[PDB]
From TrEMBL, chains A, F:
Belongs to the picornaviruses polyprotein family. Interacts with capsid protein VP1 and capsid protein VP3 in the mature capsid. The lineage of its organism: Viruses, Riboviria, Orthornavirae, Pisuviricota, Pisoniviricetes. Protein 3CD: Involved in the viral replication complex and viral polypeptide maturation. It exhibits protease activity with a specificity and catalytic efficiency that is different from protease 3C. Protein 3CD lacks polymerase activity. Protein 3CD binds to the 5'UTR of the viral genome. The chain holds residues 79 to 316 of 2188 of the full protein. It comes from Human enterovirus D68. This is Genome polyprotein.
UniProtKB/TrEMBL annotation, chains D, G:
Interacts with capsid protein VP1 and capsid protein VP3 in the mature capsid. Interacts with protein 3CD. It is found in: Host cytoplasmic vesicle membrane; Host nucleus; Virion. It comes from the Viruses. The chain holds residues 565 to 860 of 2188 of the full protein. This is Genome polyprotein. Belongs to the picornaviruses polyprotein family.
Length: 238, 99, 39, 296, 49, 238, 296, 39
């Protein structure tokens, strides 16, 4: 009942037979910007299925000494398909997301990943007064890895990361996690190339372990933008 | 109120308040551009909207730019005026600005 | 006591006793009943 | 048309237009009217409910702020061996709004103004240097500020009998007290002050140009009531004015070139742009040059 | 293109104006940077004489 | 009344003060594909203002010996803005067009341009049995020029070209022409990279002439797609 | 579900449970939900009517306290032979909430905040040592605090004409008066301040990371109005901020490692636990060792 | 709060929200309709 799930958006569909419900961030669902909250007066474009569909990122390998991985939205999707083209041709962007993280292994494997969506994950640098640079933060589709997941790379605690929308992928229990993210910003719309509303972090709290014959155990992220709308049409900049 | 678009050296006094256009022998040529910052110095600063707004820190709403052609009755021509929302460089070709 | 003309000049407002912990404690699409197994 | 405006206007959604004979984007500047082209007619818009308030640009709010109008420092001491031009424990000031440029320019944004004037007087004191090269403390002195109508008899010395103030309004205040405050009514003999006056205030041809003394509030005569101490001090009195109950008529082009005098609108301009006589706006390389172009 | 006959001027001028619409609003009043003084104006001292 | 015209689509607007009404091809107006005529079952994307807006092509110079110019739709627009991106990412395309041709001159100039929209302008080659090649036909934004406008480059007659939707730009009368084109195809949707529904042809039937000082007299084409819809989302191919 | 909570919840008495298919103590953490196991289902309870109030943990009460945000000491004297970097009878401060760590951490417990800010200015004065090795007394000086929007023209000297404050809000106060107090409204161009900002505030790639100047209240320019005394003093101005009318969104993991800079969230941690990079909690001998075991 | 006997002693009046921009923007005897050519 709560273990199988099908997500269908646009021309894309995902099935999971080992889900554990799914999380709606702060009990909200994505929606278009209403008139009583709108600021930009030009008529927005709403590509619907052309952009509100699952895009699958490159899988990463869960290793024994893995510290964790992170991706920033919309930066990770800013050069992918019609979402990327709309982002590059429009000054203003607005959308939510549907995140589906996949990781399977055998019944002889053990491991626990915290899959947490952090709003406004302003990263800090380690052992220096210099602020993180543009290249340290803006990683695109590839994303990045945690230097110190114990402190979430920001001087806070990983133990308290559960205050944020999150699921767990515990290998004995489930093989996928699903999080629904509404628009999360101080402003109704934002420039998609300079600000990142959400950061998806996958941190192996319990390391991968087994005594069978070792196999590559990848982690795969599929993100579907939702209720995409764009304002301020002009030439592409990327 | 009148914009000071021709804010260049060798343009003295009243000459700063008009933009000269001549006949060109190449197509789709750029004639001029206007920065849109009503806080820094620029063509919009010494206007009623600019002067009043600079007494304040925050601003919102739409603007309107009205161009009057002051050639002879016999003069003819078609221009294109483009507003480009921010994010990139100012367009330098017509096929980019028309987007 | 507020004789100022701007409402933001007023003293603090400590009367908002409304709560909704479930937006942080149970952000799941399918609610979980007591006693019944979650999975 | 007259209407009550509390928030900025809303935007209504618009569709494609391909109608012959209708050209909302075309205007005729020669008529002197401002273009009426709406955003709905120029582009395709969405619906926006605008809740932005407009109260901070109200003329009353725009002008009803305490602005510095006078600053006078004078020595408080025995003035037996002082020069004639020196302020001997008291000064007189013909009230005007043209000495400090921020308030002056704000007022000159309008042709006619009608307002009462809140007046705040703030006093500070310091111990004189090179008179007595030591510090003992700051006395809590009492000051008298007497309003004297323009041209009327002003006191000639600190202990003059004219300070008895039989009918003149006088305010006595201490340096330790909060700054003194009085409201002067709208006193013009006309229904409004003339911010600019294109004429001469005399029936002969030698009167001052651009000066209408009906727009001069009056004279402020400020003295230290205390007799002088054995040591000298320097006392600085600042007068601040705040218009209130304001009505404004006929807005004007704002001042661009720096002010030269409080008596006229004479202009010289900066040596080079910005705000030079031949160039108000700073220069760019060409009309095709974007000054702060974003380049990535 | 700009196309004129030989009898007309070959260079023609445009005048540009700018205004705000009625959806325009301002906040956070501040001293205008467009005016300032470094000294007392002429005849300002005479008001004390 | 019928001389001034404003066309406003998306964020784009054109004004003309010397129009001569405007033509609606065969008395029709563009519209989206209705359900009772639809074939492809996937949900189409309708970008609306992002694509249904005026795109201005490069101007060409009207000379004394000019033979005429032609552009093919949607080929001329296939690499321009969001219309181009949607075309490149979708197997199927459908739209109409709004064409506005601009050409001004002095009251001492004379000349007459036939501005005709030809449906299915299958071009022929001159003095050979070899069919025209891909490069001869597919010219993109630049377009092409007529080799023999007298026979419309297809063995037919220019004199009978008025059977097709058309206007005239007669310099003493008007300085612009406007034509509205509905979807014109045997199939409800088509592959935009291999078939061209419409060809805009501008032919100087009466050559440009004057005795004043000569000036460059350009001809400018602005085309706005209308009721754009796209089907068959996939990776960009261009 | 949304409900009005004024007191802690009551406890209901419970009986023995031996029901098949019902396991209230078992949960699934993987779903991300917090366990719903009630005390009534884990043990046998009595009935308790709980009257404990919850008002002291209200967000408004939690944040609406005057916290020190700025402390600046400067010399009040003749500054003719002073260095350029010295505060010559006045200072300027870019307002921020990141310099004093208690308030900073409390604010950073949240992602988004919306509040008006009560501001209290407290001034203290001392007689300079090694300048004049004597004490005469403390003057009752007048100070001017002018609010200048971020990036706007700030005064360049103590007696600068910029202090005339035509439109800027200015407050004049005496050391002998109670501390000055003004309320600054919620001034963000957005609907809420961004406590943390994951982006760059510039259209090029060299802008500051994590800094959104829309969340900077402004600049405070503080001067002594009095001209300098023959002897020197040291004046310390403390600015305290109290948020009020507060709304808070998206709570965050609290800061553990010590702050390094007011410009970023950079971390180094203590040399050893507690609050070290590799160990936040202090160590015990083993997971079987009870640190403060009661032994009788 | 005004206990003074003279009305001009009162605090400021920031309640006048009435506007008429057309006296500056459209001071023409014949009003101009939207869309219709001005001349």
């Amino acid at each position: 009942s709560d273990r199988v799930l099908q997500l269908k958006l646009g021309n894309s569909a995902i099935v999971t037979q080992e889900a554990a419900n799914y999380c709606c961030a702060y009990g909200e669902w994505p929606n278009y910007l209403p008139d009583h909250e709108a600021v930009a007066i030009d008529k927005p474009t709403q590509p619907e299925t052309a952009t509100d569909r699952f895009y699958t990122l490159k899988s990463v390998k869960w290793e024994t000494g893995s510290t964790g991985w992170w991706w920033k939205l919309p930066d990770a999707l800013n050069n992918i398909g019609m979402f990327g083209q709309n982002v590059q041709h429009h000054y203003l962007y607005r959308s939510g997301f549907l995140i589906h993280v996949q990781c399977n292994a055998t019944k002889f494997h053990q491991g626990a990943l915290l899959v947490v969506a952090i709003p406004e994950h302003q990263r800090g640098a380690h052992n220096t007064n210099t602020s993180p640079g543009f290249d340290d933060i803006m990683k695109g589709e590839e994303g990045g890895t945690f230097n110190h997941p114990y402190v979430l790379d920001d001087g806070t605690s990983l133990a308290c990361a559960t205050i944020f929308p999150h699921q767990w992928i515990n290998l004995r229990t489930n093989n996928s996690a699903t999080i629904v993210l509404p628009w999360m910003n101080a402003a109704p719309m934002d420039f998609p190339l300079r600000h990142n509303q959400w950061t998806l972090a996958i941190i192996p709290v319990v390391p991968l372990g087994t005594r069978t014959t070792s196999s590559m155990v990848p982690i795969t992220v599929s993100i579907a933008p939702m209720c995409c709308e764009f304002n301020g049409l002009r030439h592409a900049i990327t | 109120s009148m914009m000071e678009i021709n804010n260049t050296e060798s343009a003295v006094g009243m000459e700063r308040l008009k933009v000269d256009i001549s006949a060109l022998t190449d197509v789709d040529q750029l004639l001029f551009n206007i920065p849109l910052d009503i806080q820094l110095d620029g063509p919009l600063r010494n206007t009623l909207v600019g002067n009043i707004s600079r007494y304040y820190t925050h601003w919102s709403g739409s603007l309107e730019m009205t161009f009057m052609f002051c050639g002879s009755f016999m003069a003819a021509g078609k221009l294109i005026l483009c507003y480009t929302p921010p994010g990139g460089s100012c367009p330098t070709t017509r096929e980019t600005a028309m987007l | 006591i507020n004789f100022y003309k701007d409402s933001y000049a007023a003293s603090a407002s400590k009367q908002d006793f409304s709560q909704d912990p479930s937006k942080f404690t149970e952000p799941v699409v399918e609610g979980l009943k007591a006693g019944a197994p979650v999975l | 048309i007259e209407s009550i405006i509390k928030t900025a206007t809303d935007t209504v959604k618009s569709e494609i237009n391909a109608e012959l004979g209708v050209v909302p984007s075309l205007n005729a500047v020669e008529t002197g009217a401002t273009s009426n082209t709406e955003p709905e007619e120029a582009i395709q818009t969405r619906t926006v409910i605008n809740q932005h308030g407009v109260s901070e640009t109200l003329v009353e709010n725009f002008l009803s702020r305490a602005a510095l109008v006078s600053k006078r420092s004078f020595e408080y001491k025995d003035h037996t061996s002082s020069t004639a031009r020196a302020d001997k424990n008291f000064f007189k000031w013909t009230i005007n709004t043209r000495s400090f440029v921020q308030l002056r320019r704000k007022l000159e944004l309008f042709t006619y103004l009608r307002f009462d004037a809140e007046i705040t007087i703030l006093t500070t004191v310091a111990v004189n240097g090179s008179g007595n090269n030591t510090y003992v403390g700051l006395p809590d002195l009492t000051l008298q500020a007497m309003f004297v109508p323009t041209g009327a008899l002003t006191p000639e010395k600190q202990d003059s009998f004219h300070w008895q103030s039989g009918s003149n309004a006088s305010v006595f205040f201490k340096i330790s007290d909060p700054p003194a405050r009085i409201t002067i009514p709208f006193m013009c003999i006309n229904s409004a002050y003339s911010v600019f006056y294109d004429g001469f205030a005399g029936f002969e041809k030698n009167g001052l140009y651009g000066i209408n003394p009906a727009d001069t509030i009056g004279n402020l005569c400020v003295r230290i009531v205390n007799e002088h101490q054995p040591v000298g001090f320097t006392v600085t009195v600042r007068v601040y004015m705040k218009p209130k109950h304001i009505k404004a008529w006929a807005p004007r082009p704002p001042r661009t070139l720096p002010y030269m005098s409080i008596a006229n609108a004479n202009y010289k301009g900066k040596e080079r742009a910005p705000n030079a006589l031949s160039a108000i706006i700073g220069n760019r390389d060409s009309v095709k040059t974007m000054p702060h172009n974003i380049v990535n | 293109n700009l196309i004129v006959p030989s009898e007309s001027s070959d260079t023609c001028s445009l005048i540009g104006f700018i205004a705000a619409k009625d959806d325009f609003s301002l906040r956070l009043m501040r001293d205008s940077p467009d005016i300032g003084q470094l000294d007392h104006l002429h005849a300002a001292e005479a008001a004390y004489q």
